Design a protein around this ligand. Structure first.
Ligand SMILES: CCCCCCCCCCCCC/C=C/[C@H](O)[C@H](N)CO
Ligand SMILES: CCCCCCCCCCCCC/C=C/[C@H](O)[C@H](N)CO
Lengths: 300, 235, 237, 235, 300, 150, 235, 300
């Protein structure tokens, strides 16, 4: 059972044979213009009015070109019946509005963490052992034609943020899951030296994107730019991304949302100018498994 | 047994070899894969993603967000450059640490066209025309618009388009350029100039920022994988 | 509905025993025979009960039938710094089936091995290896034998007719005799041959509950570790 | 002879390898097999056999027969648990030394549903209803019937059936759970409660015993054979 | 003569060849819901009135799902004609009744040892060099509806019991073959320290099942439970089990019967309560070989 | 002198392969391990030594961990073990994809425990980003030879 | 060259191996064979040849011709044995050094039936009847004719036949018996008795000799070649 | 040119390939009831009146079941014409009669040595360089029905007898070739210590069969028993046996005849009783080569 493959000859003066000797395939040797070869990695658009449940919204990227979907029967690990709340949980929830000033270094949120106290979605999340959902994130920021500024919105799978102490991986659960308030990036790294009552919080540096990588490369993640001269809003459609078909929503945050001011806010000649940014997130294709008594995580 | 003769190279370990070996865990039932979004097949797929260029690497801007912003204003027209870059995507400090530069610093040879994009982040009431020029190497690097205009160039109407894209086509004596600073395979020069000036009305910010992105085109390739200088381990 | 594509390939009795388990560490010496503290040859009664791990795995079942792959890992060392050095050693491992003459000296006639299978190993070579078929006089190996080899008959004295409980010639496979073939160097050398045993082409019958307390001898006796289980509250998760 | 080249790995001994070797006893006439009853083909076949659970591992019951018996009585109804278990079939002390636990302690990964059976050993004149609950992990372990009833559960009429069977279905974030105590792959909680109370007439024992058995279902698998911690050899 | 087999590929970037180089196959490398995959290992039932010879009996397991059978001509080691007593030996013999109390730790017996003095079966056993037989074991224990208690009856092939001394395998033939009286399990291990006149007897600890294994796992053996609230009796059908097609009945005991109180006996409010347990064993498919003068083993 | 060494299997003791792998969030692959063994005398006197044999035993999580260089665990009846002879070509073995998930997680934005309301600050605490998804056991390494006088 | 990997067992020398090796005398013109009478193909062919049994190994007869002769006489009938043997063809001293015993002492396992022949070497005027008995093991070895007659046995009319043949059929618990003295695989007992007495007329020798021969039947096989204890080399 | 052979599988969980790499086949690896499997090794009988030449004789074994035959042209080493005396040499010659007493330890002879002075056969033997012949040996011993005794007659190819000195292989030609008188076995080994005039003779011990082997096993050789109660005589038909198709008759003795008293001679009550034993040997299929002057070996 010999495999006769062809070689690619370079310097000329053409087939090579390979035979597998082991039953386990892990023992085998390795076999080896503007158009984007990886069209799915260049933030493909949905190519209006988005209605989910009883919520309606009137610049849309699909992360990795993959729309949210339910678990295939071929890839279902759990065996118990899945709860699908449907319109009850799959609807747009509006988080607390943040304020963009000339001095803002950026904001961040975690999903599903930011929606843990959002109507029936939070109830289903805390009542079940396993949960899964994609998202539609709508960032809203409007300003006059005389305002200038640009925001970069990034959806990062496994958005791990650096700590603030010499102790590695020391950020406690409460500070890593702030909820809908989220957190803010910082312009510099400040080390927490309070060995008695350590803050045990993140210290996400903006130009390091909070994880030791240059912010300029954050555009490799699914992203959208809100340039105030052009558009008001940004829509990101995030499919469920994980190494598992379904996981624990309380333990693990599948996505992170980062908003960084790429161009600082400015207006006329008023040094005092602030415009709100409003996030509206709708979970999509929710499904839960493992119903039992409700989880009540520790707070503060 | 079968008569055999050991050729030179026997009992060596080449870290780039491709051989079979026994399995330490026979008959392991491997977890099947699932359809995870975002699969990468080639590193040039990542090299083709636009990433922001740290153009403004001055003393007070480097290692901050401000290094990504180039300031335009509404001053009177001049022929002095707005920014100047060298087509050394792996060794130029302003391009080395971009995603394209990071990938290139793992390889010894590169070839193909490049795609520069510039985003204007002023008010909608701002207007202006700029010139983005690429000059192939060999001559004095362009010092004014009069020289840069003689090379390849595009004219950008910021009032009309917020973004401009210039392709730097592959033009080289050699079939590949080295990923280091090398005179014999230098890539040329890139510059930006005011074609007209930037014009704003009253009650409008007179100073605004532009951002730069660089990516590879689909004709871009690299060769000779090598260790990078962008990461080191002390002790 | 879920598509259940998980196999039990690694839990087959073949995969369960598809490993080399160490059953013996045989110690031999290369030294002047005038020395009395040095053992120039070693005899090991072949068995899997000198160690516990493979024994416990095998005693999950009452009967077994398999071929056996034996691997020999040989290590050696100097016992002294002075008295010079040594040249590469050669080891003879002679299988003595029950009945064959047993060597009494490291260099007597028995090492001619005209009929006994013998394995000559050169130090520094890859570990030696041989295969053996199923060699039981019964139709399967008996991991347990609830009986005696003798039946004491009425009338004969208490000394006669006595045999150990559970001992039978079903497990009499002979021994291994090990020696260094080289003549002694002016310096004493000590070597250890580790024997690794792998059952292959395995079949088993009559599963049993595994050993729960420390093994005590070749039988099923127990003396010391008779409280294997820890304390845990009835209503404590 | 034939030119050959020795690849790395030559002259090694992997205890999990699978190679041919010469026969020390050539032409041996092997004794043919006979049809012995009770042949085992897989270890999961043994893992699927119900074996008694040492549930009552108190100080005075452990390492005796009494550790296998859980005492019920005819007291007034209460919501307190009768017994509490963790779904850690290999590391939970009450499940580790069962046949299922013994087999699992030879492997690193396990998956599949579990089957718990409870046998009531009171007089035929005794009646009662119990609740057997499994709660998937993540929340506070159930402390009363009010919480355990919110998870998976079965109601057991002991007056009607002497035995009750509850299947703990496989529900896990990962495709396999580790055979050690690991928070990230914890299996959940199991508990028993009085639904009604146990009722006996006069001239009847008011205290009785129940026994617990655990086995694997036919969808149960294990991976990564490993040495067990349940046997050791001093010297 | 190459063998081309298929690999099971896991991590993807598929056939492997094997050739046997030695004449001896021992030199070859290894080739590799409620429904019970091993139906025969889960104590299958006979799915009334059992009549054997002139004996009749009015909860039945077949050990390993294998009914007793005569030796096949294909698997006959001895060459002399086999004696088959038939109804003369294959009949139900009732052993001495034992007493189950609140304090009993259990009872054990060996087969064919327990039937060595049973009519013509014992005569045939002691007159022949080789003997073979399966068994039908009927355990009988009846009590009122106001009694509670459970017995586990286990048929163990090669039921080897631990000794009582520091000397290994020191139990003498007389103590290992008590006959129909059998022996009793103990609640604790007592070491025999009489170096002058050692008892040379077993010390079977109940929770160790007399062989160093936890009693809870004894259910892997063929077994049946007599739960007093449910059933009176237990029937075990044991085929001949051994590494040989036929062996010496005087030297070797093929089966062992163990009865352990899984739930202690109790009744009303009488602390003094005892109920009998009666064993009735019928050998099945008996066949003997090697007739000569009768064997008379040493006793006491 | 350390007669045996235990190494928690990981790629994060070095930076180069770690940086290359962390270009991506999830990965799935077989792994080829090669072992290059070097040795030296620590002293000139006290004589010489004979060729050494090294045992490398893979300890999956849960398997007993040796506490002595010569305890029972080295029997390796079930643990895969690799015996290497000094001077031979570097040892080599292959492993399939052995993750309990459907891919290796280079990043895990979560915790292994969720601290619940009521339990003390000591309970429910786990390191951020640490999960058993990367628990692959360790490697135990020893020299099988008895000690030379040097 | 071809990539190869040296498996364990390389460079070993197994004295029972079967490998090719180069010829030290290439192109040697071998002398062709001729049809020599008496070719042997199997050692069991020699084991099937009757050879005299040294039955009378007393102090004064052993290591002489007299050890091959058993003396009968015309005394009055008695039930005492004439000779007693153990069915240990390789370890019994009276059978070990027969051709069958010599061949068996090169093997570890033996099985199959045996053939004993007895030749009566008295005068033609002598008459008598004897009983040759084989008793399978397990009971007390027969001490009189009353016990030996209960086992397998033949009656030999010496006046009618000068030779008698008794086949000891293969009856064993194990499929093979060890070629050493082993209780678990003991073979049983053989004995000879006077059925009637030996009767001679006057002028006739009253004492005569019988000779014993033992061979293997065609169902006889051996296994596990081994070195014998019947030959040794001092120095 | 691969050879694919089948293995005999024992322990089951089947073909192995072999290729010869050397031109020389010596380099190859090894390829591997009362009915007697070796019928020819159990002294087959001729299944009366035997007439050869002008001699007639009125219990016959054919050694190895092979009748005497002439050299095949396919197996003729010498090239000169073969002399075949026929009836002139192929006839029965009667040797000197020996006396069997109660104390005899046995007799031995060598062939063709015993017939070296027998008519024209001896002349042809001593006139030719090469000679070949089978034999018919007729041993005659008659006694009354009141005599008892048994003789074992053995024909041994290459019957080498042990010496009588510490010097190995020291028996001189004259003592090794006694002629028709032959020699006698002894009951014990006596060492010749006369270092001045050593006897240089054999010391054949009867129970050692004169060659260090137990006499009881001499029955593996072609043989016949003369039991006085049954038969008078014994006929042995010996084919030519040698590693060569033809050899020197003066240098080499192809056969040896041994007569041992298996049962001692006895009669009535006379301690003094002796009966003659007469040997009559007829050479068969004689052929000689290499005629020259006559050989005259040294005597005494
Ligand atoms: C050629 C010299 C190297 C040594 C050759 C060894 C050959 C003898 C080994 C075979 C004897 C062991 C056969 C297997 C028996 C097992 O230990 C148990 N009976 C398994 O139940
Ligand atoms: C047989 C003894 C030699 C040692 C055998 C080693 C077997 C265990 C190695 C497999 C465990 C590592 C599997 C790959 C994990 C990677 O480090 C990361 N998860 C990649 O993301």
């Amino acid at each position: 059972g010999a495999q006769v493959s062809s070689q690619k000859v370079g310097a000329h003066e053409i087939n090579y044979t390979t035979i597998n000797y082991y039953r386990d395939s892990a023992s085998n040797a390795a076999s080896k213009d503007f158009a984007q070869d990886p069209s799915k990695f260049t933030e493909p658009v949905k190519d209006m009015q988005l209605t989910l449940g009883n919520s309606t919204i009137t610049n849309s990227v699909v992360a990795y070109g993959r729309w949210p979907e339910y678990i295939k029967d071929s890839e279902a690990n759990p065996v118990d019946q899945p709860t699908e709340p449907a319109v009850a949980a799959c609807r747009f929830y509006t988080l607390d509005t943040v304020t963009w000033r000339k001095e803002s270094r950026g904001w961040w949120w975690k999903l599903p963490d930011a929606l843990k106290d959002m109507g029936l979605f939070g109830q289903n999340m805390f009542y079940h052992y396993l949960g899964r959902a994609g998202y539609t994130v709508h960032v809203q920021c409007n300003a006059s034609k005389f305002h200038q500024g640009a925001l970069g919105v990034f959806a990062v799978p496994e958005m791990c943020l650096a700590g603030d102490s010499t102790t590695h991986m020391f950020t406690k659960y409460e500070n890593a899951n702030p909820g809908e308030k989220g957190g803010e990036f910082k312009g510099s790294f400040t080390l927490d030296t309070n060995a008695t009552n350590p803050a045990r919080n993140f210290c996400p540096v903006d130009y390091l994107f909070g994880s030791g990588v240059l912010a300029g490369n954050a555009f490799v993640y699914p992203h959208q730019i809100i340039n105030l001269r052009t558009n008001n809003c940004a829509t990101l459609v995030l499919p469920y991304v994980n190494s598992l078909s379904i996981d624990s929503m309380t333990k693990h945050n599948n996505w992170g949302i980062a908003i960084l001011p790429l161009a600082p806010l400015d207006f006329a000649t008023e040094s005092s100018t602030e415009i709100p940014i409003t996030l509206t997130i709708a979970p999509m294709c929710c499904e839960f498994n493992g119903l039992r008594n409700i989880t009540v995580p520790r707070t503060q | 047994g079968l008569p055999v003769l050991n050729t030179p190279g026997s009992n060596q370990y080449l870290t780039a070899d491709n051989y079979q070996s026994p399995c330490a865990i026979p008959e392991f039932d491997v977890t099947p894969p699932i359809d995870i979004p975002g699969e990468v097949r080639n590193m040039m797929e990542l090299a083709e993603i636009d990433t922001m260029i740290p153009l403004n690497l001055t003393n007070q801007r480097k290692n901050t967000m401000d290094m990504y912003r180039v300031e335009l204003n509404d001053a009177a027209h001049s022929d002095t450059p707005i920014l100047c870059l060298s087509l050394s995507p792996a060794s130029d400090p302003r391009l080395a640490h971009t995603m394209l530069g990071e990938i290139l610093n793992y390889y010894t040879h590169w070839a193909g066209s490049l795609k520069f994009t510039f985003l204007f982040c002023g008010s909608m009431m701002a207007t202006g025309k700029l010139l983005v020029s690429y000059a192939p190497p060999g001559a004095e690097a362009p010092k004014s618009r009069k020289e840069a205009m003689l090379g390849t160039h595009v004219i950008w109407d910021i009032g009309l388009q917020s973004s401009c894209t210039m392709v730097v086509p592959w033009i080289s004596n050699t079939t590949y350029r080295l990923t280091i600073n090398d005179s014999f395979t230098e890539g040329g020069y890139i510059s930006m100039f005011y074609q007209t000036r930037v014009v704003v009305p009253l009650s409008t910010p007179r100073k605004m920022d532009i951002l730069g992105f660089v990516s590879a085109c689909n004709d871009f390739s690299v060769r000779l994988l090598r260790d990078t200088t962008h990461i080191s381990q002390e002790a | 509905h879920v598509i259940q594509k998980r196999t039990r390939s690694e839990s087959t009795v073949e995969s369960f025993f598809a490993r080399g388990a160490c059953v013996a560490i045989i110690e031999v010496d290369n030294d002047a025979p005038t020395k009395r503290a040095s053992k120039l040859f070693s005899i090991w009664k072949i068995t899997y009960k000198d160690t516990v791990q493979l024994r416990r795995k095998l005693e999950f079942f009452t009967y077994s039938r398999f071929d056996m792959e034996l691997t020999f890992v040989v290590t050696s060392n100097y016992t002294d710094a002075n008295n010079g050095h040594a040249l590469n050693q050669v080891y003879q491992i002679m299988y003595i089936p029950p009945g064959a003459p047993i060597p009494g000296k490291w260099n007597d006639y028995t090492w001619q091995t005209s009929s006994n299978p013998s394995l000559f190993y050169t130090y520094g070579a890859p570990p030696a290896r041989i295969s053996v078929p199923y060699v039981g006089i019964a139709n399967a190996y008996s991991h347990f034998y609830d009986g005696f080899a003798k039946v004491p008959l009425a009338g004969q004295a208490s000394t006669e007719g006595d045999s150990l409980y559970g001992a039978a010639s079903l497990n009499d496979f002979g021994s291994l005799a090990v020696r260094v073939v080289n003549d002694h160097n002016p310096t004493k050398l000590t070597s250890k041959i580790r024997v690794y045993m792998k059952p292959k082409h395995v079949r088993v019958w009559c599963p049993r509950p595994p050993r729960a307390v420390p093994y005590y001898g070749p039988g099923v006796d127990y003396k010391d570790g008779l409280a294997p289980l820890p304390e845990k509250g009835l209503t404590t998760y």
